[PDB]
Amino acid sequence: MAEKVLVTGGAGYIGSHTVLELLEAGYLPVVIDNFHNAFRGGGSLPESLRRVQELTGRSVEFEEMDILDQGALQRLFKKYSFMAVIHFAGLKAVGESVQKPLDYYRVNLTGTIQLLEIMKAHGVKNLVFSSSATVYGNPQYLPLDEAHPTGGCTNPYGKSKFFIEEMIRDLCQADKTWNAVLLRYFNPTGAHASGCIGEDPQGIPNNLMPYVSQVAIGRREALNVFGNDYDTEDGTGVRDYIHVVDLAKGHIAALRKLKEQCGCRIYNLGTGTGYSVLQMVQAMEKASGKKIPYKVVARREGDVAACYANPSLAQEELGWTAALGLDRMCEDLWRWQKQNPSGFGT
Amino acid sequence: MAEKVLVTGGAGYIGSHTVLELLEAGYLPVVIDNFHNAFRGGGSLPESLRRVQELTGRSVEFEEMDILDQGALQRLFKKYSFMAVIHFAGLKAVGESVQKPLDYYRVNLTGTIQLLEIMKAHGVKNLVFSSSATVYGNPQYLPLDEAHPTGGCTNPYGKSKFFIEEMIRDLCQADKTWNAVLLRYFNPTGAHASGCIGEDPQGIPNNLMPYVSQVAIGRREALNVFGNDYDTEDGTGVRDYIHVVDLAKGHIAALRKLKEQCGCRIYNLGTGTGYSVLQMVQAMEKASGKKIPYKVVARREGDVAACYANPSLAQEELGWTAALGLDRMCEDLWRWQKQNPSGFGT
Ligand SMILES: NC(=O)c1ccc[n+]([C@@H]2O[C@H](COP(=O)([O-])OP(=O)(O)OC[C@H]3O[C@@H](n4cnc5c(N)ncnc54)[C@H](O)[C@@H]3O)[C@@H](O)[C@H]2O)c1
Ligand SMILES: NC(=O)c1ccc[n+]([C@@H]2O[C@H](COP(=O)([O-])OP(=O)(O)OC[C@H]3O[C@@H](n4cnc5c(N)ncnc54)[C@H](O)[C@@H]3O)[C@@H](O)[C@H]2O)c1
């Protein structure tokens, strides 16, 4: 495989993991990031990628740049021969999307548009887009499948995701030579089994794990449980979490699919089983050996009882399955944290 | 009124008419256009605006520029003091949106984003956005009102419109100091009573009138009527057409509303009565004095029986009403055409 794979936002959480899977699988990745939300390593790379090289014994090509920079993109594309692009570059803090909508739309939509245009200009018509199952909006049924209506999104982040999917679909509709796999998933968690890489501490987490996990290290007193009266097995809310490793590998599987001139395809990635808040607390206690006290507070406005995806189609068409469960997610997460209390540091 | 009103895409069909109404009403407009879809006048202006000056005896400031050009926008904003912006700049040929989606998303979304950003940077937080009632998608009920669900759009044009509305809404949600009126309408038709300005002949018309009108001048044999079996008064399809003058004035009304620190408001503009294909043919015969032969062909895939808006809210909140009917639309259109067979010419 003399041809490279471009990974935008490859220094990030999901990107770094994906980059590692790419290396392990025999691919040659070129990564670009502007460091908006990644730690600056000691060398020529971000800390996350420096550790990836160490972990794999393989190297990664990396370029610091912003996808909003057309000049940078032209140069990049002229300098390398890409067989495909995996697009992770973007803003993804849901709580922040509400306070800073323009930045979300600007970076996500505009950035994407710029990217598609350069791809098109360079004849690189193979893309894997890292989407979000939030596009389904509130479940009209469970589990959520690829046939569920999309576009019911409430926040700017969600809408931006959905907007991007639509543009990709339309483009594929207009030009049959394009191949694109849109991957929809919920909450990524866990980290590489080494415990050497993982998710750095985020200002406004998108999910519960980091919170559960803080309470375990004592960096937090007790956990707040919004509602225990839902129509669930245990009364608590049911969410969809997927191990970052499993998710990174699913991105590799989509890349192979492109090769088949698949045109535009859409798949949900997940374990197929949702997890309750209680279940997660239990799982984290088990992994940490620490006690996690919690407090039932009242149900959050808008919160739904359960929200999880059906990943059948991906198994069928991509031959992909999530091998990691709740327990592994907890262990792996716990390990990265214990090992790197503050995330990255040179 | 020493403060100016910026009109993007002001050389166009709807823009020019709006510019005239602005002049007549006492406002000072500054217009920008890149000439993507407007005729280059003899002087310093597009032909459409040159005629507007003549018609009003008032002048317009004009700048040739692209809304995608950030530098141009910065300069513009530094040079003038705007009290508000009326945004018409964009690609709007529905048939073309399908073949060239990227261009649609690029010009419409990106252009808009750039504009909003400069407005925000310059403290110009008052906008009138020329939207499209196509965002409602297929009627789930009639007449379509402001409470009807939006986002069901099938083509790239429609989606782009809807995407823009969402971003504006989110921005207003995040910053309360913003005022924005989103105007949703269907098919603009007719022209200034002078017959001096109107819509130049389009490559891929968005509606039926131009076709009906061609058959009348003999520039076309007979009209094709897709279906005569719809559950309508006459079996033929029911659509929403609005006189361009009435629509231009509604844009003036929205501008006054901004003044009231209205925040984000949305209104449908229309006559409140839909017109059948037959009715239009009749109306055009009356106006032209010419015969318009037509042929019933089979119903178009996807076509709905009737599609029209309820403009009550605008009357209530903007104090606006459509004063012009079908007959005037036909007469006015006929007059512009007879007077200017080929559209603009220096
Ligand atoms: N974290 C989540 O819960 C989640 C959920 C669903 C989908 N996703 C998608 O995953 C992708 C990113 O994944 P993530 O969760 O690892 O977050 P992340 O922030 O760790 O990584 C995104 C990376 O992109 C970089 N980046 C941001 N803007 C950039 C720009 N303009 N140019 C270049 N690089 C830029 C950031 O610096 C960061 O390294 C996004 O497409 C996001 O929508 C994430
Ligand atoms: N024609 C319609 O049926 C219709 C229906 C609904 C809403 N609208 C909205 O009306 C607006 C335009 O109205 P129109 O119907 O008179 O068409 P129009 O083409 O006559 O005018 C649009 C104008 O914008 C200019 N323009 C396009 N891209 C530009 C750019 N990048 N920078 C600067 N100027 C640019 C074009 O040259 C043209 O003068 C759009 O927002 C459109 O979506 C039109």
UniProtKB/Swiss-Prot annotation, chains A, B:
GO terms of biological process kind: galactose catabolic process; galactose catabolic process via UDP-galactose, Leloir pathway
UniProt-listed Enzyme Commission number(s): 5.1.3.2, 5.1.3.7
Root EC class: isomerase
Isomerase keyword on record: yes
Gene Ontology, cellular component aspect: cytosol
Cofactor: NAD(+)
The reaction(s) this protein catalyses: UDP-alpha-D-glucose = UDP-alpha-D-galactose; UDP-N-acetyl-alpha-D-glucosamine = UDP-N-acetyl-alpha-D-galactosamine
Catalytic center residues: 157 (proton acceptor)
This protein's pathway: Carbohydrate metabolism; galactose metabolism
Family per similarity comment: Belongs to the NAD(P)-dependent epimerase/dehydratase family.
Summary of subunit composition and partner proteins: Homodimer.
Protein name according to UniProt: UDP-glucose 4-epimerase
Natural source organism: Homo sapiens
